[PDB]
Amino acid sequence: TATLTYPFHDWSQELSPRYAQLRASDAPVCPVVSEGTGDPLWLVTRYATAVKLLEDSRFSSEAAQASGAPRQEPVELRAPGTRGDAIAMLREAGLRSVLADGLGPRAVRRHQGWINDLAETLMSELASREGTFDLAADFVEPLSSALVSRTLLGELSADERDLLAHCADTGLRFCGVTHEEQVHAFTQMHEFFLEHARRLAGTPGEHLLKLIAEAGPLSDEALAEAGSLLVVAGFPTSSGFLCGALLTLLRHPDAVQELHAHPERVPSAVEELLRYTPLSTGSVKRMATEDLEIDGVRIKAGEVVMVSLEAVNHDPDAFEDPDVFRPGREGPMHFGFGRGRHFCPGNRLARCVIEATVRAVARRPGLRLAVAPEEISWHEGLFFRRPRAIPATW
Ligand code: HEM
Ligand SMILES: CC(C)[C@@H]1NC(=O)[C@H](Cc2c[nH]c3ccccc23)NC1=O
Ligand SMILES: CC(C)[C@@H]1NC(=O)[C@H](Cc2c[nH]c3ccccc23)NC1=O
Q1: Counted domains in the chain
Q2: Which of 11, 57, 114, 334 could crosslink 275 through cysteines, CB 3.0-4.6 Å?
Q3: Which ligand is nearest to the CA of 275?
Q4: Does the Cβ of 65 fall within 6 Å of ligand 3?
């Protein structure tokens, strides 16, 4: 119909041209319809409007997560007949800040050493390789697997890691699998944690699931909900983003040569990667809890307004030459971690692993993509973009 269906099927790093067109339209908020549900939605693509949306106390993230809310995802991101309200259930137990606490600056100071050791071990192994090697399978996968075990869930076996990763990939999708396969992915996840979360939380370590369990005691359902939250929020984001960041670096050898010569510039390159490299193929979303206007557009209570972080991060009103990867950039704050109350509580740990990845690349001149960027294959339909492989050579 004449109402755009959402999302825009831009599964590779090439952002859908529709975002820029909506950004330059006369409307600061554009009505769309969810392809997966037919629900009406509003879409924001301008930085200035997105700031207003994500800092407005009348827009509720949790209300947009509730069952029956208009939504972009085809299947609800909860197990059948469960609350799907992990952050609120943690706060109910009196754990208001455990996620930020276990992922903040002190946690980076605990984990940054081994994270950098491992990035270096993995890249040193690749430096010994002949011919073409795969940066997704042989760098991103082992690094993100270690991140998950050591910081989020506890020591997982290869089979457990494989199962949770498959559940995330299958459930967090707009298309490419059946409805039944999507629901089953969340089931295997929830039933996995109902059985194993107590065991995982009880093993020695600093992992977040232990911190949650060991801080009326927490029920197995709340602890299982916490496990599924950590998988959904932590696994496909880290693997998708690290893959995409590697692609960005390989496509910008001049920038990498600068980082090789001036390693103190790496933190700024991390921030530019967070702005430039696209991640989600949908939008962050909030529900209006009362009638309001945003930039003149009237929104009724109950309606859901979305912001594409990719669109905002590429807004020329905010970032001059927004489609240029410019590590020296000194523009406004990027939206890669969101904005306001729900700003990514994993942001410091994520920055730590991105930095370690950038340094591992910058230290080794000659690394290059083995084929043209347009020949990279992409997992079609994931919420969190990820290439199937990153073939590279020296
Ligand atoms: C490069 C990696 C990552 C990126 C780009 C990223 C990005 C984001 C963004 C944009 C949001 C805001 C969503 C919204 O406003 O609705 C968010 C929220 C969140 N992130 Fe991250 N994230 C990353 C890694 C992680 C990791 C490793 C964890 C560990 C569990 C994590 C945990 C969370 C949680 C729990 C939330 C929900 C906060 C809330 O809704 O209040 N993230 N993330
Ligand atoms: C299920 C939780 C993640 C929960 N559900 C949400 O919709 C929001 C936003 C969010 C952050 N990271 C995600 C990854 C996949 C899908 C959604 C999200 N925050 C939550 O804590
Ligand atoms: C149904 C999907 C759109 C799903 N629903 C969400 O609420 C989050 C929001 C989000 C946008 N960018 C991100 C980056 C990292 C973590 C979360 C997000 N993303 C999704 O893909």
Answers
A1: 1
A2: 334
A3: 1
A4: no
